[PDB]
Design a protein around this ligand. Sequence first.
Ligand SMILES: Cc1cc(SC2=C(O)C[C@@](CCc3ccc(O)cc3)(C3CCCC3)OC2=O)c(C(C)(C)C)cc1N
Length: 563
Amino acid sequence: SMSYTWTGALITPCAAEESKLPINALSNSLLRHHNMVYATTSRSAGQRQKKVTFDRLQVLDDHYRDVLKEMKAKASTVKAKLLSVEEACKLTPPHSAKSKYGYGAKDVRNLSSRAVNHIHSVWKDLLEDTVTPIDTTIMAKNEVFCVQPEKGGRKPARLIVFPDLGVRVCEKMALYDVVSTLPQVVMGSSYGFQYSPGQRVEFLVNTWKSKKNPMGFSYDTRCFDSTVTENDIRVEESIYQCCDLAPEARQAIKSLTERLYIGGPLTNSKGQNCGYRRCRASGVLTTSCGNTLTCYLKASAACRAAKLQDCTMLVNGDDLVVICESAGTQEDAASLRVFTEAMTRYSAPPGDPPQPEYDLELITSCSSNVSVAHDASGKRVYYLTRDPTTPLARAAWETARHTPVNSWLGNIIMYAPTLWARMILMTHFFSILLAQEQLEKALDCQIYGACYSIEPLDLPQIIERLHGLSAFSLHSYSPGEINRVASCLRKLGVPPLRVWRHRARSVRARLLSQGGRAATCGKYLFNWAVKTKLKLTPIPAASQLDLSGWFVAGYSGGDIYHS
Ligand SMILES: Cc1cc(SC2=C(O)C[C@@](CCc3ccc(O)cc3)(C3CCCC3)OC2=O)c(C(C)(C)C)cc1N
């Protein structure tokens, strides 16, 4: 059927949308080529609409059914529980979209009677009615990127489809526990969101080393959300229902699937009807879990079709990477063509053709790749990294304009061991925090789609617990990694190592002179910038964080917040 049908009504904005990086003394010290940085707006929504709108064709086969049966078996061992209205309310992000029924996120988190009355009513209606399509709002995402000359053009805004706040809270009550525990049980080691960056690296390196002639490849589905059929979404629901659930959770899940996950009318911000969706809703609680289950299922069936030898997968939503035994270059190319044909029949056709890689550092999955460096002792240390272009463009934008979510903070946490996060992100942002005397100010940032409120002063313990003390001492980065970063710096017009080290030494001196937590930041985060290094012993505050739950499941588009 058609993934979308349109009435002609436009996907409209709610407020002014900036498309170009504003000229600003602070972002300019980060990078000078501001014209290279842009933010998508609803102006390009039509472009994205044309691309995501197409007819799906899907044929299933024994390999698909066998894998599905095995997935259901694993699911049958999971017991999940309903979330109380209060537990659900606590997960709502402080600035989540407000309801159209006279109440917003502040109200829900406060448990105002009006918010709760409405939550009860929606829940009650989900139980009584399992058929009326639930309304959804469609908006054009406003994300920042850097121009890609090699691509020929810029990216259009991605689209986000989500239900009313009241429905979102009910989604948490019925499915939060399921989407939190089911995926790892059904997909085992292949479930990507269970790993911290360090653990992902460990899994990837051990897997690669376990093959005799290792070959790896990532599979890019053209518009995965749009390729998800009603069949896929119903198959997902049957896997959820395999869990031991409370009668009410079962009905609510059946209802959300029929009335919302399967499809529904699209309404723009002007209140007009834009059309109808028959594919995955990008902004619901089950988007991450569903996407990973479906990608996993089709890919596993596809590995069998292509007869890949001793393959191992790693899936994160629509992101997929397979590592297997190589059978030769011509044979590997052939194997990948069959694999792609299988995925296409399953309604998961490719964007870029998959291509065989024989070097682990060159395989990019989840926009990342493993790389190597050496800690203080000189020993080799594998770590996760990525091309720093989008992180830096976004850091520039967030410096010039106030952002709800601070991707720069999330990036420092996830890519703490990288030379670019240390040289540029830490130095640039601590300088500004020093300037504004905002080191204590908690900021929102996201990790695996969930929102976290984190205090910059706690970065040393977070990074130590997350990456270990080595993150504060890596040096001798790979020539490839260094080339990639230098290339990016000249493309965006970012200052060089000499300038950043000089800046870091100033920032470090100020931090140290302030004492307290600030001093520890100057000491650990900027030890690289001084000739006479201090010695980084284990920070005692590390052992006490509650860093669990951080790498348990994905929640992109799921409206999740964590205290
Ligand atoms: C501590 C240490 C550092 C070094 S050099 C060095 C780096 O290798 C890493 C790093 C520089 C990485 C870098 C390299 C090239 C660039 O264009 C931009 C950045 C990073 C570290 C954090 C920000 C920049 O900091 C450094 O000073 C060396 C060499 C033998 C390689 C000279 C030995 C030891 N023991």
